[PDB]
Amino acid sequence: IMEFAENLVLRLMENPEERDRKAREHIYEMHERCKKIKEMWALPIR
Amino acid sequence: LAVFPEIFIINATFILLIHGVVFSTSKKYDYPPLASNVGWLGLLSVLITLLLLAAGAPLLTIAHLFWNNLFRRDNFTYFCQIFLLLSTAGTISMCFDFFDQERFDAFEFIVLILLSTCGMLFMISAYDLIAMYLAIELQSLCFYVIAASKRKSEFSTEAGLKYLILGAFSSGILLFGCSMIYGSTGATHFDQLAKILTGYEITGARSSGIFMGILFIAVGFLFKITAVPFHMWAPDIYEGSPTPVTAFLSIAPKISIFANILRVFIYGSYGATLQQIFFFCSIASMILGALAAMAQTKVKRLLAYSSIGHVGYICIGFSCGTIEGIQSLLIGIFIYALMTMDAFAIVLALRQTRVKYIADLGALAKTNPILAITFSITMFSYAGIPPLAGFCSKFYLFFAALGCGAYFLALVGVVTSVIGCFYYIRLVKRMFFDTPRTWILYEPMDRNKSLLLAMTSFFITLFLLYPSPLFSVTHQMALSL
Amino acid sequence: GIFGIALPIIVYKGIVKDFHMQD
Amino acid sequence: DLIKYFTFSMIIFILGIWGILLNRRNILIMLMSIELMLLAVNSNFLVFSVSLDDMMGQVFALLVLTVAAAESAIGLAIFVITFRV
Amino acid sequence: VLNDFLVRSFLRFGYEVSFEALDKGAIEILGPYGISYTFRRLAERISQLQS
Amino acid sequence: KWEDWELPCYITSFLTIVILGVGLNAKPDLSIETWAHQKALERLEME
Amino acid sequence: LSGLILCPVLGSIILLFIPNSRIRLIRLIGLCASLITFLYSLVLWIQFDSSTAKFQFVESLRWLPYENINFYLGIDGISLFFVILTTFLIPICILVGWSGMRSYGKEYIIAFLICEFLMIAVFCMLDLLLFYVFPESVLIPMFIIIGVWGSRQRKIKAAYQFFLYTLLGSLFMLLAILLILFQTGTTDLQILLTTEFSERRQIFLWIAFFASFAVKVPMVPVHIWLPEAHVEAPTAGSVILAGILLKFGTYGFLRFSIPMFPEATLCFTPFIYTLSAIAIIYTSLTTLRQIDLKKIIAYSSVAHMNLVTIGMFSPNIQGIGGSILLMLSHGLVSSALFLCVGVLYDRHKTRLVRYYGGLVSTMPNFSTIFFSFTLANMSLPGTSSFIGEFLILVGAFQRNSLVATLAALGMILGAAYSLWLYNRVVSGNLKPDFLHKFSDLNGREVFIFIPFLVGLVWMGVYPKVFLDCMHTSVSNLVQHGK
Amino acid sequence: MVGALLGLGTQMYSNALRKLPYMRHPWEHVVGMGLGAVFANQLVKWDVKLKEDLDVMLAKARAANE
Numbered sequence A: 001i002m003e004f005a006e007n008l009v010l011r012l013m014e015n016p017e018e019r020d021r022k023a024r025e026h027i028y029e030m031h032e033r034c035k036k037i038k039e040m041w042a043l044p045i046r
Numbered sequence B: 001l002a003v004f005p006e007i008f009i010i011n012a013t014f015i016l017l018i019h020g021v022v023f024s025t026s027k028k029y030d031y032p033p034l035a036s037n038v039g040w041l042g043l044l045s046v047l048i049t050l051l052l053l054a055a056g057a058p059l060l061t062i063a064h065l066f067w068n069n070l071f072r073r074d075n076f077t078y079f080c081q082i083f084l085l086l087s088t089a090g091t092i093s094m095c096f097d098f099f100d101q102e103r104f105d106a107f108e109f110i111v112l113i114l115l116s117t118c119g120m121l122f123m124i125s126a127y128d129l130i131a132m133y134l135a136i137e138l139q140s141l142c143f144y145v146i147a148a149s150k151r152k153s154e155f156s157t158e159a160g161l162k163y164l165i166l167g168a169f170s171s172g173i174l175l176f177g178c179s180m181i182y183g184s185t186g187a188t189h190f191d192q193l194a195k196i197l198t199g200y201e202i203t204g205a206r207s208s209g210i211f212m213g214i215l216f217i218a219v220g221f222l223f224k225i226t227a228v229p230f231h232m233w234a235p236d237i238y239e240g241s242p243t244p245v246t247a248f249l250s251i252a253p254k255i256s257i258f259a260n261i262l263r264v265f266i267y268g269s270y271g272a273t274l275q276q277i278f279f280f281c282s283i284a285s286m287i288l289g290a291l292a293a294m295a296q297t298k299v300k301r302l303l304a305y306s307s308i309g310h311v312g313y314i315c316i317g318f319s320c321g322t323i324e325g326i327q328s329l330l331i332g333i334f335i336y337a338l339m340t341m342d343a344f345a346i347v348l349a350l351r352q353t354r355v356k357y358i359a360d361l362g363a364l365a366k367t368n369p370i371l372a373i374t375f376s377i378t379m380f381s382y383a384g385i386p387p388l389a390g391f392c393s394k395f396y397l398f399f400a401a402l403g404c405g406a407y408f409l410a411l412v413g414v415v416t417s418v419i420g421c422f423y424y425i426r427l428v429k430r431m432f433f434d435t436p437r438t439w440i441l442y443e444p445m446d447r448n449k450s451l452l453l454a455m456t457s458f459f460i461t462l463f464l465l466y467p468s469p470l471f472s473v474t475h476q477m478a479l480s481l
Numbered sequence C: 001g002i003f004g005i006a007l008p009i010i011v012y013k014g015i016v017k018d019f020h021m022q023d
Numbered sequence D: 001d002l003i004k005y006f007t008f009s010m011i012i013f014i015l016g017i018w019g020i021l022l023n024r025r026n027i028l029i030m031l032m033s034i035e036l037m038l039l040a041v042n043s044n045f046l047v048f049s050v051s052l053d054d055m056m057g058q059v060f061a062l063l064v065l066t067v068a069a070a071e072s073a074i075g076l077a078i079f080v081i082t083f084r085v
Numbered sequence E: 001v002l003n004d005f006l007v008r009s010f011l012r013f014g015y016e017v018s019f020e021a022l023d024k025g026a027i028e029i030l031g032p033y034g035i036s037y038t039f040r041r042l043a044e045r046i047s048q049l050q051s
Numbered sequence F: 001k002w003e004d005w006e007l008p009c010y011i012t013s014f015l016t017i018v019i020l021g022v023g024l025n026a027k028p029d030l031s032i033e034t035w036a037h038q039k040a041l042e043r044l045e046m047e
Numbered sequence G: 001l002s003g004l005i006l007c008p009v010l011g012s013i014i015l016l017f018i019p020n021s022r023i024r025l026i027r028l029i030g031l032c033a034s035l036i037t038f039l040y041s042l043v044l045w046i047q048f049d050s051s052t053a054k055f056q057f058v059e060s061l062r063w064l065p066y067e068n069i070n071f072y073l074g075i076d077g078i079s080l081f082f083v084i085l086t087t088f089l090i091p092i093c094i095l096v097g098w099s100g101m102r103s104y105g106k107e108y109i110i111a112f113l114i115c116e117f118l119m120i121a122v123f124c125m126l127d128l129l130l131f132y133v134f135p136e137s138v139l140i141p142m143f144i145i146i147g148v149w150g151s152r153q154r155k156i157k158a159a160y161q162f163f164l165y166t167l168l169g170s171l172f173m174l175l176a177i178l179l180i181l182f183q184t185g186t187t188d189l190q191i192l193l194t195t196e197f198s199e200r201r202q203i204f205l206w207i208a209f210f211a212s213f214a215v216k217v218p219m220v221p222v223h224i225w226l227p228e229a230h231v232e233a234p235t236a237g238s239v240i241l242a243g244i245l246l247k248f249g250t251y252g253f254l255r256f257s258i259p260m261f262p263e264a265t266l267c268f269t270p271f272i273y274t275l276s277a278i279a280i281i282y283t284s285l286t287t288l289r290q291i292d293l294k295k296i297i298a299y300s301s302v303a304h305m306n307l308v309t310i311g312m313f314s315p316n317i318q319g320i321g322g323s324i325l326l327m328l329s330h331g332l333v334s335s336a337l338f339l340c341v342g343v344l345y346d347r348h349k350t351r352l353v354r355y356y357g358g359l360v361s362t363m364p365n366f367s368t369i370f371f372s373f374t375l376a377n378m379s380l381p382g383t384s385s386f387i388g389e390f391l392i393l394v395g396a397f398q399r400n401s402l403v404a405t406l407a408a409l410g411m412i413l414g415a416a417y418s419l420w421l422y423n424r425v426v427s428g429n430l431k432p433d434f435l436h437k438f439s440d441l442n443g444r445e446v447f448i449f450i451p452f453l454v455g456l457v458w459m460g461v462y463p464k465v466f467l468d469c470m471h472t473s474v475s476n477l478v479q480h481g482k
Numbered sequence H: 001m002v003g004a005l006l007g008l009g010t011q012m013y014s015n016a017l018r019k020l021p022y023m024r025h026p027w028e029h030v031v032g033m034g035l036g037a038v039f040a041n042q043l044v045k046w047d048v049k050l051k052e053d054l055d056v057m058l059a060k061a062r063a064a065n066e
Helices: A018-032 B004-024 B044-055 B075-100 B108-124 B129-147 B154-185 B190-196 B208-224 B234-240 B243-268 B275-295 B299-318 B323-349 B369-383 B389-403 B407-432 B447-461 B468-480 C002-022 D002-022 D027-040 D042-052 D056-082 E002-050 F011-021 F032-045 G007-015 G024-046 G078-095 G107-112 G118-124 G128-148 G160-183 G189-194 G199-216 G225-231 G235-256 G262-286 G293-312 G317-348 G364-377 G384-394 G404-426 G443-461 G471-480 H002-018 H031-060
Strands: none
Touching (some): A018 G189, B004 B044, B075 B108, B075 B243, B108 B243, B154 B208, B154 B234, B154 D027, B190 B243, B299 B389, B323 B369, B323 B447, B369 H002, B389 B407, B389 B447, B407 G128, B407 G160, B447 H002, D042 D056, F011 G078, G007 G024, G007 G107, G078 G118, G078 G443, G128 G160, G128 G189, G128 G199, G128 G235, G160 G199, G235 G293, G262 G293, G317 G364, G364 G404, G364 G443, G384 G404
8 A cells, every 4th residue: 555556556547549549550651652653753744 | 043052152262262372372471371271261162152052942943044954953952962062061171181281282272172062063953964064074173183183292193193084084985975865865954855765765665876875874974973893993093192182072973973863864864774784883882892891901992992882882772763762872872971071081080191001090999099989980880780870871772672672682782781791890899909000199180070070970870869850851852853 | 410400300390290280 | 977977986986995995004095085085975966966957066065175175184284293203 | 328328428529519510611611712703703804904 | 784884885776675675566457367357257157 | 658768878978978087976876877767667567557469658759751660669568577677687787897996997988888778779669670770789889898898818709700690690680671661661560460461471581580580599500609709798798698688589589570470480380499499409418518607608598598489489378478488587597697607707817617616615605696596597496487498398388299308308408517517616625726815795796696586586486477467468469370 | 959968979079089178168059059959850840841742742743543
């Protein structure tokens, strides 16, 4: 016990959105897989 | 406007050239040595330009008069030119010792470096075969002169002479390429040459004139950047010439010619047909770098072959025309330039020695141990040791080579980089943990080398902790092309 | 003998494979 | 007939590069061949400007003239310095 | 059993240190292998100077 | 064990040992076994 | 973790502005910075929840914008107590160096080059590219620790052909890391987990990682760098080497081999089986040939580490638990034995091994503690190493127990030569030529011994607090391997 | 920011390379590097903005999904 062990554990709590973190990471990398395939296409620009 | 970086550094060179000539030939001032006074104002004409150039970032493209005639500035030319002036700033800064200690009253070495920097500023923004050639030869001519400068020691004279021969012959090859391309296309402007060379497919479509033209341009360039099959004198060029002029014609022409290659070979002609010679050059350049570095003794020639090998490690980023590849090539030029300015700043700190090899380089772990730490940092950086910046350069280059499907290019790169890592780890060990070997003592380096070595040593070690700015810069430059 | 253990080691591997074939 | 006035320039250039390769011993012939190949590309620009009926060829040929001339100036001056006193 | 252990320890030393020397000798040989091939090709390259 | 005679300054290390001693269990629970004896105990209730 | 993460770097850098010839301050404050980073490692332990597949305290900072290959920092399961062991052990190196003058061995330099928590980085680094940078990166700190204050037995060097191969293997893994990185844009370890590769390529990528790893892991064809690296290593360079630098290869396999390439791992199970088995057999028989004490302990470490490999293979939760707990017990035991042999060197100042004699007279408490740890390096049932090694063994759980039968020789010869060498060292009243210089151990010496014995016994009698805090993570890894 | 610490190092590292001791008023001019670090981070933000602009221009280009 020692007068604060109860609230001594609430230094983290679930907050489970870190999986939406990787969800949108995956959107990032799905786009990034188009990093090296792209190149010059425009002959109509300036 | 739009030439205010050039209008200035041309007026400033004249103001310095007249100011230097009037005083050095003055009885009233007892014919003073105007070096380190036209210098200082030289390198400030660089910084004021770098301030005139960086500030007017939207203004560089302020006219059309220049566009379809002379030269086209854009974000790539802008960022690569802020780098050339910054790398010319380092190179003038490291020479300040070479002007005072070494007896040079020849100030016009400074004004020739300034005229060469204007020639390079016009190379980066060169957007027409004629302008590309003229700026190339302006900078190459300033460099032939300032590489044949030392007239007392015959060793620098013949080195400068073979540098002039190699450069004039390289420019002849490049110019015959420009001739074949122009003669077979009737258009020299890169904006015009781009429209013709869409769907050229030499290996599939019979066009021998344009093919031989692009081949000769690539050969002339690979001569200028002293790639492997055409280096042919580069070791002796870097060894014989004085140390600061070696530091100049070894880092700044690389930057400038490589930006020029990105212009002509990624916009003027875009195909997988020409980059084959650069693929072969990359392979054999990494090979030659690794092996000859394993073979050399003289620290100047060791840096020569190390620079050849690293130029090889650059061209693998050009050996594939993907944005990741070009960005890897640009990352590789910045981390090769800052590291080479550092290595040459170190070699210039050791003025006391004559032409002496790594054995005489020894004892630095004892005499000036912080300088030995810096030298090990720089040599590791060339090797590509993970916690440093050269590792980031070589690693992003290999990752671009893998993403470009050139798995064999990445393989030869990794084996050559591991050979280099072994050689440089062995060099650092031999310098630190053994081999006292005659204890040559050095006069201390000056503040100018000190800050450049210190800031660059900080850049190499504390790079992975913040690679976002440089990566953003180089990816923007690659997108702009 | 060393190459003997090297090949008998993959032979024990093959024994695991024979056990996998047992079911 | 353009081929006659180009392949002849092309093989003048080949003579220049050939003399470059052989004469790595003697440097005055090296510079001779340098200006040779900077003519065979210069005469090449002029021929290709007459053929294509385009003036960029002659502008570039004039600038290569007044650049190869400065190159020969600095080349021979470096060669004279190389034979020190 | 002790005769077995003596003969087997001798044979064990033999096998293990033999393959150890095999490894090391392969390394030693395969160094100058590449060295001498590279030097022969470079020798052709430097005879290009005066072919 | 001479607190005033800190000739090498072992006081830092001794206080660290004391704080490790007070490095209690904290009764975190929150385990796969702790959660097992609840979910699988519901499964036992299914009998 | 956000703020309490960078304690060693902040400490090192803000001490770099204190050259301070009078050593007392740099020693005191470097030791305090190390001890507080260890305290924050341990409060991070207390902060742990043994119930999530997610990583416990995730943090990041953009490193390169596109594809965001950023400093992704997770500490779930294994890494939790790997970084704990790292911190646990770094003050040990800082504390083995209360040497009075410590002048040529400039104290602040070794402080600044041991107080680099790139080991913490790599164990928390959860995107295998930057994760790659760190084990290869720690080689620059390791090389300076290994010889700058390291004992000079030879012209300091490593086998050059072997070293070139070792670094070539490391860079071969780099090509594999890039091939996966551009294979599907997958930046980090969570998404490299999620993704699925071509079985034809999974095996190539697995062996390509395995090159660098099985160099870092001491497998039979390439392990020679441990003895030569240790006999020259300093007293505190070996404590770090055995402690962490070997854990590097096994943790690399654990994170970036098993849940990365499940099909390739399935295919190569017998490969690593035989490799680690014959490695244990060799390193058990070898200390016959080796008389050098540091080589002896290094080879026992090779044996234990290839046991860690022969256990990490498994989808057995007990299997990988025994693997990681043999890792913890090994970072305790081999580092405690390196502490031992370093004290035994210095107190005797001799680098022959036949010369350590009459120890029960000179330093009998060192005899007691040396046994208290050599029973562990042979894994006396009851010690932590026993729990580790026997969960390694039962790792033949769904198996058919044919590699346990080679671990038979591997461990029986290991325990045998462990006892033989503990005898050979403490045997007899073999009077040495030390001129009645007894060199009884120091209070700080028995102190730096305290934490290893404490961790060892607290595990060996109560492995719960370590098997718990781990089971959720390893079981998630296993189901991804299912 | 961290630029202040870095500058004091760059200046002190400079002093260590010329052999001079670690002393003078240039350690108070490292505040200029603190200004430099703030500008470099500011340029990182501005630069990633411009790169996102060029990237949406590229996304508009390259056949725009056709």
